[PDB]
Amino acid sequence: MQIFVKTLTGKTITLEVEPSDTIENVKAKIQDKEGIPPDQQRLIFAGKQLEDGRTLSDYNIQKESTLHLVLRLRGC
Amino acid sequence: MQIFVKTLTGKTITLEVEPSDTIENVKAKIQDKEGIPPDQQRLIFAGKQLEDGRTLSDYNIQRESTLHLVLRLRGG
Amino acid sequence: GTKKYDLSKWKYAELRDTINTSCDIELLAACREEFHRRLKVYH
Amino acid sequence: GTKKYDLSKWKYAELRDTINTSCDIELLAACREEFHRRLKVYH
Numbered sequence: 218m219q220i221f222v223k224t225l226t227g228k229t230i231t232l233e234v235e236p237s238d239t240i241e242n243v244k245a246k247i248q249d250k251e252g253i254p255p256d257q258q259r260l261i262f263a264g265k266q267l268e269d270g271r272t273l274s275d276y277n278i279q280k281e282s283t284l285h286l287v288l289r290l291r292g293c
Numbered sequence: 294m295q296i297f298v299k300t301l302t303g304k305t306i307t308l309e310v311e312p313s314d315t316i317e318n319v320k321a322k323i324q325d326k327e328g329i330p331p332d333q334q335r336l337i338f339a340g341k342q343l344e345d346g347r348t349l350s351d352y353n354i355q356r357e358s359t360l361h362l363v364l365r366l367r368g369g
Numbered sequence: 370g371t372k373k374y375d376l377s378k379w380k381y382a383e384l385r386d387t388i389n390t391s392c393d394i395e396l397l398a399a400c401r402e403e404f405h406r407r408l409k410v411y412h
Numbered sequence: 413g414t415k416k417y418d419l420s421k422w423k424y425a426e427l428r429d430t431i432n433t434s435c436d437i438e439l440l441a442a443c444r445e446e447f448h449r450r451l452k453v454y455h
């Protein structure tokens with residue numbers, strides 16, 4: 218499958234994956250593309266924050282899905 | 294357990310089921326009543342999409358529940 | 370309920386996503402409308 | 413820079429939660445920018 222990832226400015230990123238792929242796996246791929254560490258990543262698919270222990274199938278995230286990438290800020 | 298299913302136009306449908314009924318079983322019941330095949334269906338409740346491999350109880354869907362029926366447009 | 374919404378400036382992903390991530394018979398109808406139109410529309 | 417929101421009265425939980433609960437790219441951008449500024453600058 219091929220999913221898209223919209224950045225803040227607008228820069229989109231296309232990544233090839235499968236419904237089984239784990240969110241954590243996707244975040245890792247993005248980290249290999251840009252330079253944002255996982256802990257500093259957050260995937261949101263329309264008012265839906267994806268967990269790091271789930272699969273692109275646990276959200277019905279089909280193909281050509283635009284994933285909003287947000288820089289996970291610190292906290293505690 | 295009697296449940297209501299609101300259509301797009303506004304026509305509602307009363308379907309008799311049980312908390313142990315699988316969304317897939319329900320979709321089938323509708324396919325028999327109207328003519329919309331399962332794959333071409335999508336129920337929404339409490340503002341949440343219902344999965345096919347789940348049951349009504351797995352969504353706190355009690356009796357007299359209003360299920361939003363949407364025609365899953367196949368394409369993408 | 371009165372007057373739909375012009376979802377012409379919308380996108381395929383948005384519309385689909387909305388129906389796959391939103392819950393509003395109103396929007397669902399509007400989205401399904403523009404969706405069907407796109408198929409029935411061909412200059 | 414055009415038509416923005418005044419996030420000069422938000423809280424840590426608001427921004428963090430809003431970003432973790434919301435998905436409004438616009439807000440996300442303004443939320444992150446204000447979050448950083450607060451750390452970088454102090455006025």
